[PDB]
Design a protein around this ligand. Structure first.
Ligand SMILES: *[C@@H]1O[C@H](CO)[C@@H](O[C@@H]2O[C@H](CO)[C@@H](O)[C@H](O)[C@H]2NC(C)=O)[C@H](O)[C@H]1NC(C)=O
Ligand SMILES: *[C@@H]1O[C@H](CO)[C@@H](O[C@@H]2O[C@H](CO)[C@@H](O)[C@H](O)[C@H]2NC(C)=O)[C@H](O)[C@H]1NC(C)=O
Ligand code: NAG
Ligand code: NAG
Ligand code: NAG
Ligand code: NAG
Ligand code: NAG
Lengths: 262, 540, 540
């Protein structure tokens, strides 16, 4: 999946998330590339930032591929909202089980220090739907805006989830439609950031870090638009973002979603 | 399990407090502030003391008083902005300074110097004569650590800088790296724990066509089962030019490593796995060797050992079979030679079978792919004599630093080894000639009176420089550097019994003074020493 | 790594030489000959001392002098023919005698006794009252060792004899065995090192529906890699009747074992693998537990530890997943429950799911075949508190024997542990209540004057019997048995400071004598003891 970002005045950039086919050294799993207005630009699709040690990209570690046969990360959807871009992924759980996650980056963060990734899903009646199938960004409508305590023109992510965390290739029919206000996603991330910058626990992102890494306590104010530093990143988390389940079925599997307000 | 031998002589703090100490004073003398010494090195005839904000120089040859004085001082402090950034990121105030962690002779007129620079590693060139910098400051990333407490390796060979450290503030990306020297930069494969798994870098030596790196790391051999640390040696080809467009571009094409075997063999072998220190290559008994100190893990009953390794046995391990894991669930096994590509992985371009290859860039893909996935050798390097030369398992501290005089005695043919420790205790033994060892001396050299000030009492020996020409072993602590005589010969005064029983290569009874003195290869005088035994047959 | 705590009190040989000693004399008194004591046991009110050629009995209750005297003596010497055969096979003359290695109460009138009998193990019944044998001698094969130096287990339960030893002169066929008791004989599968791999047998307890065996053996978990010894506990069903015509006929159908976990956890865990001793089941703090002593391997820096195990945590490990090796070249992994047969291997006939089965003989083949090939559990048994209660890592000797008083103090509710060692040193600690421990006393009880004779000075503690009713711990050496008072209370005389600071459950300050004395649950007198602290606030 990809997301183009270009404001008035900016030349432009393209965020791409992709499976890498076990060729982790050929292809970044997520990165930012230049997308200049001039089609003839000598910089077209170059990395936004390329340095010996710091580039605008994430690579899957060899270690992870070694731990899980045919490990890969699938990018189901992606969108921009406010000052951030978001990617929704499915991948094997590092020691089968799959984990569906929300990945957030600041729009303006060539070093990728803002990387944060949290699992997400929803539940209803003892049933957990934790395997992402499809998603779509839209407005809430009056009822949902009330339920979420947000304004009418704030963004909401609608998503389809299959039951459980197993059987990615052959999902049961049991599936659900779920809604996540962008506001709650951002809030839960900010709180994760604040907890981490207070020195509580670890980064909890084994697949990318390859080991337990402690959160660093530091005198840094975290606001709604915090864009990271070279400490406490990339940032993970074990506690899921829960969505509001809207509809469930056990009969005919849900495969797609779009939405608007009338 | 073998018991700890007793030393022939013991020098208590009572005695050694008379050894000259450096604490950073110029001649003339006032409250002392901790020096935060990082390392020491002798080059030419100058002793360099790398520390926080400074490098102090000592004129080894003209030092002749109770206090060792500073001759000249390099000053390099971090800009306030860097300090602020460092504090802002949560590092303690005491950490956010410029600690000098790299000091190397670049050429006859130039010192290469790197400092942690408040967690923003930076490198500079200095004129040797004036100790002033010339040219611009430049990146210390991958060349110098961020954290003064971290261990690191830095070494020049043919103008190229070999370094081992971490590249990132968080110290996740440990690396073995090469830059400068009008050659391509190369690094170990990032995030590949088969290449490196949380390594602690100890030493590098330049030997033959290779650089050898000594370190410890988590052993993938013990993946299944628990976390275990193994000691390693690793080779890289000095002429490495990196891989092709398709494989190991910008990475080593010659990186291989192997377990070092330091053990007391038995019903079950007892390994000392935690590598503490390694010497430079030393010629001993016609062989090129290094000596290394190993300890048991910090979560275990404490023990230390000294093993020696022949550079030929090291070279040898890298000609043997590679290790592999036939599956994420199987044990590590040797790869059959039939499955090893040609040219052989780890052999340098322009070698015997490889004259066809002008550089590593032209290596075939099956070779590059194989070494990228098999950096580890199957066998462990045997130690000389296949057991430790020296053991300490009855003390609470660990052996750490090591220095060697391979030309001790009237006839410059004895091998004496000096061992530092965490408690400021120096150990001295003679290497029998290469089997075994004799425990000559244990001494407490830490000097509370000179070294315990500004609230710091840290007895950890941070470096030792043995200097034959001045007859001394210079011993660095965090707050002070001590000048220790190689021998305590004249100490025995006119007691021949004690002198002879010392069995110390440096010492002998001179029949012209009726006294015990240190012997020099220039002495035409007649001496008496019985080293092969200490036969007294009194009394003093 | 945690340091060794200091004991509150230290009793030197100076003091303890006054403790009464048994050396095999009858009242009246002459040159002493080594006793070659094998073991001691108290039954009823008699102390039995098993030795070469004899069992000596001591009347515990009427022993009231400096020397402990013999009351009665069983005599069983090998026939000359057996001695000759033994010598002919190359065994030393001193070994070719009848050493008593099994002594058990068969019933209220009968002792079951087995002796090595010059490497021809043999068993006999004796009348308790007269200590005379009745009936015929019979085989000790698989019941008693050939070699007096070998460790062995023997235990009666419901008339059946459970034993662990070797069946053969060469001691290749180690076995866990059951015979007698009008039940079928059963054994572990001969020459199957998955069942047993060079085991050293330590202890067996009767608990619930099972017998539990404690031993150490070479760990197949470490097949690949080196030889490593692990400590084990193993279950067998008391009602086992053996297998079917097709599987495990005449063998256990209930044999499972598991690693015991005695470790100091850390970055890497430090294990004490060499199991030395294990108590009987003891009720402590409302729980049924055993205590066990572990040491480091003999080819290693010496260390000892005491861990406790809850009988429920032991039972628990045997309900978990089995271990397996998916291939001669893979690591050991857990078996998924889906692959485990029904009925479950290791569950006793007539159990919950198994009322359908009258005896193990009727078990199905998939169940019997599975347990025959998977005797080992995946998990290790956790220790109470998940770390040792007590450590010694700064001495040259190892902790061995263990005895426990679970009813010490005026209120019979303190847990005091006594630890023997290789050097005749007894250690005494209080188990805090089940976390931690307090080091009350270290004492040297070996008595050179009484115990070092006939050329033997062997300070190894060979057994300890704690006897509340006589207020004593009986400590066996090769040449002597020593009677040690549980407490050294009256020792403090009239010094209240010392008495209170002892912090010893047995001791207290009595305000009616103005003196420190041992406290009994029968004492109506008013005492003072501060055990939760030793607050003195002088002087003596
Ligand atoms: C470390 O060195 C020791 C000493 O050479 C090795 O011990 C030997 O192991 C071999 C089997 O490979 C035996 O044939 C020798 O008898 C052993 N020597 C002794 C004196 O016991 C040990 O194997 C080495 N360890 C490793 C991992 O290579
Ligand atoms: C022996 O016991 C220790 C203590 O319980 C175990 O250590 C724990 O290991 C687990 C992982 O299985 C960790 O989650 C705990 O944090 C560890 N405890 C501590 C305090 O470090 C150890 O795993 C046990 N060993 C075996 C072989 O079972
Ligand atoms: C909803 O939002 C309003 C402000 O937007 C706030 O006052 C109120 O606390 C919220 N409702 C809740 C959480 O009860
Ligand atoms: C080493 O020291 C000598 C003086 O002893 C000095 O003259 C010379 O410059 C030094 N050699 C070099 C430059 O390496
Ligand atoms: C060292 O050399 C001298 C003669 O050159 C000899 O006397 C002494 O034994 C030698 N010791 C050795 C070989 O270590
Ligand atoms: C135990 O000892 C008593 C004497 O104290 C004795 O009368 C009795 O026979 C013994 N009990 C048995 C037979 O177990
Ligand atoms: C033991 O019991 C007595 C009262 O019965 C009490 O005073 C003492 O604190 C108890 N100690 C324990 C619980 O170990």
């Amino acid at each position: 999946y990809g997301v183009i970002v270009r404001s008035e005045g900016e030349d432009g950039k393209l965020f791409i998330g992709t499976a890498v086919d076990g060729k982790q050294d050929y292809f970044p799993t997520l990165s930012s590339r230049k997308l200049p207005r001039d089609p003839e630009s000598s910089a077209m699709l170059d990395y936004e930032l390329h340095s010996d040690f710091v580039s605008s990209l994430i690579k899957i570690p060899s270690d992870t591929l070694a731990l899980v046969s045919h490990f890969d990360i699938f990018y189901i959807y992606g969108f921009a909202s406010g000052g951030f871009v978001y990617f929704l992924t499915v991948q094997p759980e590092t020691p089968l089980f799959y984990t569906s996650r929300i990945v957030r980056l600041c729009k303006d963060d060539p070093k990728f220090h803002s990387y944060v990734s949290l699992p997400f899903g929803c539940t209803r009646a003892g049933v957990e739907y934790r395997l992402l199938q499809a998603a779509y960004l839209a407005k809430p409508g009056e009822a949902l805006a009330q339920a979420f305590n947000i304004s009418s023109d704030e963004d909401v992510l609608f998503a389809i989830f299959s039951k459980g965390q197993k059987q990615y290739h052959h999902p049961p029919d049991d599936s659900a439609l779920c809604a996540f206000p962008i506001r709650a996603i951002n809030l839960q991330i900010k709180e994760r950031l604040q907890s981490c910058y207070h020195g509580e626990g670890n980064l909890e992102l084994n697949w990318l870090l390859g080991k337990d890494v402690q959160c660093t306590k530091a005198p840094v104010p975290i606001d709604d638009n915090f864009c990271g530093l070279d400490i406490n990143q990339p940032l993970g988390g074990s506690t899921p973002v829960e969505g509001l389940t809207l509809y469930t079925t056990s009969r005919d599997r849900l495969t797609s979603v779009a939405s608007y307000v009338y | 399990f073998p018991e700890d031998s007793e030393p022939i002589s013991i020098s208590h703090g009572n005695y050694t407090k008379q050894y000259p100490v450096f604490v950073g004073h110029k001649p003339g003398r006032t409250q002392r502030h901790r020096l935060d010494i990082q390392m020491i090195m002798i080059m030419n005839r100058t002793l360099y003391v790398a520390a926080r904000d400074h490098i102090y120089t000592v004129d080894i040859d003209t030092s002749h008083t109770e206090e060792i004085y500073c001759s000249k001082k390099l000053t390099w402090k971090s800009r306030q902005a860097d300090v602020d950034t460092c504090r802002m990121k949560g590092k303690h105030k005491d950490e956010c300074h410029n600690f000098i962690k790299v000091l190397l002779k670049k050429n006859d007129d130039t010192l290469f110097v790197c400092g942690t620079n408040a967690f923003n590693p930076s490198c500079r060139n200095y004129r040797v004569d004036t100790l002033e910098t010339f040219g611009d400051e430049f990146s210390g990333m991958a060349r110098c650590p961020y954290d003064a407490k971290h261990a690191n390796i830095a070494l020049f060979a043919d103008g190229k800088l070999y370094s081992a450290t971490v590249t990132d503030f968080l110290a996740i990306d440990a690396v073995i790296y090469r830059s400068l020297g009008d050659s391509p930069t190369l690094r170990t494969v990032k995030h590949d724990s088969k290449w490196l798994k949380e390594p602690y870098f100890v030493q590098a030596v330049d030997y033959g066509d290779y650089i050898y790196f000594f370190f410890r790391e988590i052993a993938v051999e013990y993946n299944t089962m628990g976390k275990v640390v193994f000691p390693r040696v690793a080779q890289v080809c000095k002429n490495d030019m990196g891989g092709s467009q398709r494989v190991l571009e910008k990475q080593w094409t010659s990186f291989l490593k192997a377990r070092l075997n330091c053990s007391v063999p038995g019903d079950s072998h007892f390994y000392f796995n935690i590598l503490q220190a390694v010497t430079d290559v030393i010629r001993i008994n016609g062989r090129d060797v290094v000596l290394a100190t190993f300890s048991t893990p910090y979560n275990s009953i404490p023990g230390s050992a000294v093993c020696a390794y022949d550079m030929l046995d090291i070279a040898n391990v890298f000609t043997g079979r590679f290790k592999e894991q036939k599956s994420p669930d199987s044990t590590w096994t040797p790869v059959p030679d039939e499955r090893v590509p040609k040219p052989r992985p780890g052999c340098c371009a322009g070698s015997s079978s490889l004259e066809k290859y002008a550089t590593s860039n032209e290596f075939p893909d099956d070779t590059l792919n194989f070494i990228k996935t098999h950096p580890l050798m199957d066998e462990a390097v045997p130690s000389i004599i296949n057991r430790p030369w020296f053991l300490r398992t009855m003390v609470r501290y660990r052996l750490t630093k090591i220095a060697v005089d391979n030309a001790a005695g009237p006839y410059q043919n004895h091998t004496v080894v000096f061992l530092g420790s965490e408690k400021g205790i120096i150990l001295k033994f003679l290497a029998r000639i290469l089997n075994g060892s004799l425990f000559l001396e244990e001494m407490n050299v830490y000097n509370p009176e000179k070294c315990s000030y500004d609230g710091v009492e840290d007895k950890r020996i941070m470096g030792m420089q043995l200097d034959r020409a001045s007859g001394s072993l210079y011993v660095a602590f965090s707050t002070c550097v001590i000048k220790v005589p190689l021998g305590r010969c004249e100490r025995h005064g006119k007691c021949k019994k004690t002198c002879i029983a010392s069995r110390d290569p440096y010492c002998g009874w001179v029949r012209e003074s009726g006294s015990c003195a240190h012997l020099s290869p220039l002495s035409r005088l007649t001496f008496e020493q019985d080293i092969e035994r200490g036969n007294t047959d009194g009394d003093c």
